[PDB]
Amino acid sequence: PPYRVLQANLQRKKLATAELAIEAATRKAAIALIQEPYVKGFRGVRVFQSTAQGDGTVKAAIAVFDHDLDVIQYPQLTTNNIVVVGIRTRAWEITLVSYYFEPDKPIESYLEQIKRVERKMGPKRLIFGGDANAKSTWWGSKEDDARGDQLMGTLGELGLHILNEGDVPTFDTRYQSRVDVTFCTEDMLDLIDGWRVDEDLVSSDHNGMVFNIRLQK
Numbered sequence: 001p002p003y004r005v006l007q008a009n010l011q012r013k014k015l016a017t018a019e020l021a022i023e024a025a026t027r028k029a030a031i032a033l034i035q036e037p038y039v040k041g042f043r044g045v046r047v048f049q050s051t052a053q054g055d056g057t058v059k060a061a062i063a064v065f066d067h068d069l070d071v072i073q074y075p076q077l078t079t080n081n082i083v084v085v086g087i088r089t090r091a092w093e094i095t096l097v098s099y100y101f102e103p104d105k106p107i108e109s110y111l112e113q114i115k116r117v118e119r120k121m122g123p124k125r126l127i128f129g130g131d132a133n134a135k136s137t138w139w140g141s142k143e144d145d146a147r148g149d150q151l152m153g154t155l156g157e158l159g160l161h162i163l164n165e166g167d168v169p170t171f172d173t174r175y176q177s178r179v180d181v182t183f184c185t186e187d188m189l190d191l192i193d194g195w196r197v198d199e200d201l202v203s204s205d206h207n208g209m210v211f212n213i214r215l216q217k
């Protein structure tokens with residue numbers, strides 16, 4: 001009965017999104033928190049995207065593979081960097097968010113978007129996943145850079161808790177790093193487990209991640 005979630009930065013690779021589809025089928029995943037999707041493989045899959053750019057570029061999206069899962073969109077909260085979507089079942093109602101922060105753009109405006117989502121969406125049932133392009137030992141990075149610090153500060157103000165674990169690089173090229181973060185409201189801990197990094201849930205310099213949403217009660 002666990003709702004499995006996939007988190008991955010596809011880097012606009014046509015192949016990576018094919019791999020993502022294959023992994024979701026295999027793992028029987030219900031959700032995918034995506035960043036940098038390309039522009040096919042997703043048939044009866046509902047996809048919710050962040051505001052598209054002139055050339056059609058979408059930086060974040062949320063794929064729902066579970067055909068019967070109740071979904072609710074929040075156009076007011078979705079931007080060019082984040083997409084917010086609620087999922088509902090008898091057991092609960094969870095607001096999900098997939099985000100992507102450019103490595104060469106001020107993180108400040110993105111932190112405000114996180115705040116806006118948190119306040120205008122209640123202090124409970126929140127799960128965020130994406131590429132923050134920010135380093136912090138709190139999520140296994142080699143060190144705490146200034147971006148990681150700003151993000152951590154924001155997390156602290158919102159009561160958001162890091163789900164990351166281990167030191168497996170979420171980005172490998174050599175050059176390895178952990179810039180992808182997953183965090184949630186306090187109440188979500190106890191409903192989430194199995195957070196791990198698929199050594200290669202894909203093939204686009206970024207490593208996919210996986211975790212479950214249960215009930216335990």
Ligand SMILES: [Cl-]
Pocket residue numbers: 135140141142143176177178179
């Ligand atoms: Cl790192």
